[PDB]
Amino acid sequence: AQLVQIARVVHLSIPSSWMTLNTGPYIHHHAYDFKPGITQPSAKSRDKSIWMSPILKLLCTSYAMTVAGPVRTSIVTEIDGSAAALSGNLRVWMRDV
């Protein structure tokens, strides 16, 4: 599965306005969901990263595209709750709908 293919499972899609830009590689290797030297370890997605990382990358690139000016590297720095708690709640919501 591709990044967007899996990220759409929670209705995270690509805006039509982006369809004229080469966003692929940026989302692939410029939106760090876990930079070792910056992220707090609490945000470490661990094994669920296989399906967690695309979601975080989509959120990161969305924020980066939001601000004006040149495109900058996007990095997750912290999740207030543990990444495990976030994954658990997401699984609950996925099961609910």
Binding site: L12, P15, S17, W18, S62, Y63, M65, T66, V67, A68
Partner: protein, 49 residues
Amino acid sequence: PILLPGQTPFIHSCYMPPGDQGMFSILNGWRDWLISHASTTLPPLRHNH
């Protein structure tokens, strides 16, 4: 939006995504000012968030 309270006008690009994504990105940038300002202006809520 053109200008939020406490911010500077024209800092949001047109490529801002619609829907929840746009909301999240806006709030993420706006986070710290809101939290600090709320503390000064309003009494604290009754149990942790």
